[PDB]
Amino acid sequence: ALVARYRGMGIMADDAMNDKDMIVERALDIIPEDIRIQRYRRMMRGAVLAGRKLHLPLELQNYDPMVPYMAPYIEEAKFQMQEEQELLAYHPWDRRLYTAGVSGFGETSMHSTFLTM
Amino acid sequence: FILIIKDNIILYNINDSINYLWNIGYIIMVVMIVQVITGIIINLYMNINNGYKGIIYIIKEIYYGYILRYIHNNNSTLIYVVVYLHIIRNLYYKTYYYNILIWYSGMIMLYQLIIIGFIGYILGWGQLSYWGITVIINLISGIPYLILLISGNYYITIVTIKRLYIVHFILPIILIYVEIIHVYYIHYLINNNIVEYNVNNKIIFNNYILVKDNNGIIFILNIFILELNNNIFIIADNDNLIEINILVTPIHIIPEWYYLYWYSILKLLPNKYSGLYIVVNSISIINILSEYKIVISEYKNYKNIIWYNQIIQYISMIYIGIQLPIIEYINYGRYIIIFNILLLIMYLYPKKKK
Amino acid sequence: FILIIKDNIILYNINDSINYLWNIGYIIMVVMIVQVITGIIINLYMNINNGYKGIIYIIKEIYYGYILRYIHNNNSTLIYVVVYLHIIRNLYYKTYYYNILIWYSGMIMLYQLIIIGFIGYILGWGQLSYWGITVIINLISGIPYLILLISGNYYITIVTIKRLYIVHFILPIILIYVEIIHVYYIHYLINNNIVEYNVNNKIIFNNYILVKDNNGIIFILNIFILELNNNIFIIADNDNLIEINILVTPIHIIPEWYYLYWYSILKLLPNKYSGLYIVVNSISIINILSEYKIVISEYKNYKNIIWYNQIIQYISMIYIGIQLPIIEYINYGRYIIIFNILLLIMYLYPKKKK
Amino acid sequence: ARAYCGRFAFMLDYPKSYHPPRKNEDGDYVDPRTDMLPKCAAECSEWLTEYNACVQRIKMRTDGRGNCQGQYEEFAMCQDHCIAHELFHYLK
Amino acid sequence: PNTKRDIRRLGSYPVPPESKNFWRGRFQVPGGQIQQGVSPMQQKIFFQWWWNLPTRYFWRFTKWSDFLIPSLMWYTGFLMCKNDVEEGTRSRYWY
Amino acid sequence: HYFATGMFGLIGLAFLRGTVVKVVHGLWPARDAIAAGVIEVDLRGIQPGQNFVVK
Amino acid sequence: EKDPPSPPDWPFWFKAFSHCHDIPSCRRGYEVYRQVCATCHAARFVCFRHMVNTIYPENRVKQLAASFDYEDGPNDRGEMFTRPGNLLDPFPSPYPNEEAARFANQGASPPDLSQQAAAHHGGCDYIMSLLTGYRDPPAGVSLRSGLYYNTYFPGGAISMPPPLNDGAIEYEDGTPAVASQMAKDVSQFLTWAQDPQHDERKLIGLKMSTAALVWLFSISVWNRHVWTMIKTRRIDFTKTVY
Amino acid sequence: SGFGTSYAHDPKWIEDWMARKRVGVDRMDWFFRAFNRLRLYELFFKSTPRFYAFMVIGGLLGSYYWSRFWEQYWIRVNKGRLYKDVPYVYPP
């Protein structure tokens, strides 16, 4: 069923990954443009078809959706994150709280919590 | 605030691929406002002195008072339908995996709603509400002296009503504040789509999503108007129109339909506290269903077989609650509770590698 | 909201040259919160069906109920004292010339307060309260049929109490919202100083101004605690402890001390509507006292002779209101009203050049 | 909270005509329901046989225990459903 | 908001205060796109609902058929319980 | 198109008027209060010199 | 055990969406209540003025109320007197307190019939079924003096004597007075008494429901219009079609 | 065919259905031409104040006559069963 759903959307399995996951985001930073361009077009077509309650024509459905094209970059991203974790986040650091638009409890983006509005 | 409104209503971008199940939330907000307004207006003609006669005086003497009385009762049923359907949706599309903050804010409103409703039916001074608060207050009978502090007497009396009424008046306004915290996280943490990924297909809200959201709300209004004026569905038990007699026990001390899933839990388990505790589990375990997972996936858009069996478990437990405490229903209901735990365990457990 | 709090409380800079007359506003905000809390708590034990017997049951049966009853009555007196003193200050330093937006926001709260206090008096359900509302409501007796819509009957009954009570419960929460709009303009439009110009002498609020503002509030608390427990000053008329009798008219139908200025205006002018209209003038003309001026000056830190005669006019009118309607007091009071019009014209008029 | 559940009139089979109640030899009108009792009992014969069987089984018991209320309530509910479908046609 | 690469803006013009959420949902379009459309005032506005009607309901019923087996097991249990309750009541009481 | 958007406004405004007007109407003296308020007194049967009391 | 037998679904006129309370039946129902049910029950929350211009003309309601004697007071001497009834009086109550009533019905309390048409599962159907549901006791069931069997009362044994007997009253309109008629009529009247605003609710509901349908069609055309812009767009990447 | 499986595909009749695009056909244009001859756009809709006046005035008159129509509908369905339709005969 999963293979059929991917084929109907015209997308690959790795396209389905949500970039709200931080490993996926860090991998998508370093994918080559050729992979990136085709990944966007497939995801765009999938959302159009899903929104309009349509399915990809069968003429275009004869492909293997489980090709792991993101694997090299997922592994690189995990390696980069593990280094940062081990070399820069080995202790619960103390910082001045609610200053510069950040809670001081660790997040790095300003105005990214309710109490930091 | 006009710029805030423009940023959150007029220039707010949402994916164009969302279904009508993404309109449920708009309906909750609108029906919630209606319940506050009608409540404040009813209180203009009734207070806590004697609700039984007060409800009679509203429906018979006040001009168009019947509208206020039946809207406030039926719109509660509606609030709980839309909320419970909003949760079923969020479970199906697993909208708690990456937007847990939104899920947490919602659960807070669910907790508040469960207290607002219970106490409103004692304001009617009816038999089934008198004897249903007398049976739920006696679940905290273990904590020493706490029942007396809450009740204000050794038996439920006008004193108990005068205080719960203030909680019923004020707690809804706080709920509206938590609704802002909820819409705040939704707007920052972008909404989930019918597709698992994120796509550049967003369109402004006022010109498109609000027109569609109104088509939805007007559809529900047609149906709610029919119930409001013709009682097509029995959503209020008739035994709440019997004057309170503290000597005679009602034929059946059951809650309203939207507390029958936690009433059954309490009538099925053999120890009173075990029941209370399994009612905590139901409202608490559902807040950690993605915490122990370890794979880069949101478990979304599969066949959702586990989800279907959970939604049916809820419906089946509500049925057992309507039924009297017959032994055969108790045995079958205990199996349904065991099954819920196993289904919940399946959501919680991470997977080993072949 | 923590960053908002830090921007408006911890890193908020205020001039170091301000007096203790710049602490009055802090006190209003604190005493206002106390009046809401005590009101909600009193509501837990009060039955608005008979508030005469309800107040007795609070002071005699509820544990420490006397504290709640007397705080809620005396803290009202306190609210009006601090507010009226906050206006006197704003007039003396002419803090409406460049900060009119702050003045407008404050006046809105003054209007709301005037309605809250009056209706709260009627919830006491005593002789004075009943006859007082029966007299005020009959000022809008000209607008056809509107008395009936407000009262809900041909005479004041519990029907009227049940509706005004909702206005008394809800209107204070709106006042708190307008307080935010007020503090918003104050923080944007910087506060005025004891000196007419703007100087680089500002210091943070939490470390300095809040310590001083608390010394002020604790000073007032010492005095308010003495009144709260020993009634050093008669701030509540005794005739509100007489059971209502529609047949007998009270010895004197007067409002609380903080409504005596407008009561006198209405008892002095010979036409009922003229009196109502001169009350409107009092609470409206003071909002345009700098609009017609044309000089580059704020008319500040002069001898303020016109101001002194205005503050005394207020006190003298309150005296005439206490006094029975002796003809002599009416003639003298009409002169005081003519004098007030003249003093207010002095503020309004721009000056020609020699 | 309310006496009835609303329905479309096409779902509410209201009598389309009125047949006056029969008059007795004495001249007193006979209750339409009493006349409908035998006919509706026949329509519920299956439950009536169950009840009649119970009566004979409790008759044998040499102790004084035994009731047939359970089976009577099923027969009565059946006979009454039959009456509801045709009684108001004889009532004004 | 979207990924930090997606929300990174090419222009130096400041983000308008009323468009904060709008620009936190920006995407960096790779390779380009050619978007086209026609005003609804010059189009048939109800036809597409009819054109897509059969396929919409086919693909909906084929997915909802996944729950058939679950549904049947639950109804079998509902019938078993109902009958068990009735036989138990007739056994405890009902001479 | 503007007829359709306008009809949504036409019907909406009617529902709003009706809602607001009926809410304010509930503040009018109630049916029981109106009945007691106005009292018709039958003068038939009184005799000259008789005094009666009506609450 | 099982819950009390469910009442049959009677075809009352007012059950349809666009139907009213049949005033002719409600009038007969008042007669049945006044001459049969009132001896033991009270309708505290039903007032005579509720029937004016709705069930009976104003003069007729005056005559009905004046037939009863109420206890009003005090007089100028602090004493209680008895006066004829008025349009502002509640329906008369047979017993002064619940303890007096219980003492006159073998300890059983005749419930107030003001909201009884909606206080039992089945609603109006429960009243019709109960009044016509008296039967000879089931075999093996023996009832003491003053206890009667009824299939719809919880338990089967009710302390109310069978109240409706043929010829008990004569209807003013001439309708044949049979037990089933009186039942159908008193059930109708008690249903009206519960919610006298039933007809206003349903006439205003009719105008709201029909209007809401027209409203649905307007918002639907609007929704279909604006979303055409979105649902017919064409995004191309390596292609171009005009 | 293939309904209920991973091989599910649109049947031939669903595919023929989607092959009928109706391009160039407009069978409902007559209604729009006729509606445009009422000049509602040039008179009311185009100007915002006049559009507001159409919604207000049209909602005032529409609400009244809608009520009038459904009142007559009710008076007819319930003929003979309304208080006004059955004057009461006082007992002698």
Ligand code: HEC
């Ligand atoms: C006139 C036709 C009526 C109607 C419409 C009703 N009654 Fe009676 N009733 C009596 C007593 C003693 C009781 C209580 C008995 C107990 O339940 O043990 C009742 C009860 C009722 C009910 C309520 C049934 C319920 O389940 O509680 C209703 C709806 C009802 N009655 C209707 C006694 C009497 C009389 C005493 C002789 C008479 C006469 C009537 N009832 C007449 C009527």
Ligand code: HEM
């Ligand atoms: C007072 C009840 C509540 C109201 C007012 C409400 C309101 C809304 C609104 C308006 C939306 C955005 C629109 C939508 O996508 O439908 C939404 C989203 C959401 N709500 Fe609620 N909600 C409530 C109850 C709850 C509860 C109890 C939960 C948790 C069990 C919850 C969890 C969520 C989640 C996860 C989302 C995001 C869905 C997605 O990802 O888009 N809500 N809610």
Ligand code: HEM
């Ligand atoms: C989350 C919002 C609310 C819900 C879910 C809720 C729920 C309900 C419920 C279920 C009833 C019982 C109705 C009946 O008797 O059958 C009730 C009664 C009541 N409610 Fe609310 N309510 C809400 C908010 C409010 C508010 C804000 C007020 C106003 C102060 C209010 C005022 C009343 C009053 C006076 C009653 C008693 C009258 C009645 O029985 O209808 N309610 N409420």
Ligand code: HEM
């Ligand atoms: C601007 C804030 C408020 C002021 C100025 C105000 C004023 C007063 C006044 C003057 C009284 C009469 C006291 C006496 O009888 O002598 C009163 C009574 C009362 N107020 Fe308030 N009030 C405020 C807000 C509130 C709030 C928020 C509540 C809670 C819902 C409340 C609840 C009550 C109650 C129950 C009474 C009657 C009991 C009493 O007589 O003490 N008030 N109020």
Ligand code: HEM
């Ligand atoms: C509910 C009553 C009100 C409260 C809570 C309140 C609160 C405050 C606060 C906290 C301040 C800033 C601190 C201060 O300088 O003292 C202030 C300033 C001010 N208020 Fe109010 N106020 C109220 C009533 C009023 C009224 C009725 C007026 C107008 C007649 C008014 C006009 C002003 C003005 C002009 C200022 C600025 C004073 C200066 O320039 O610094 N306020 N108020």
Ligand SMILES: COC1=C(OC)C(=O)C(CC=C(C)C)=C(C)C1=O
């Ligand atoms: C009468 O009202 C109610 C009950 O009566 C039995 C409930 O069981 C319940 C459920 C209670 C718990 C403790 C889960 C609620 C909330 C209720 O409203």
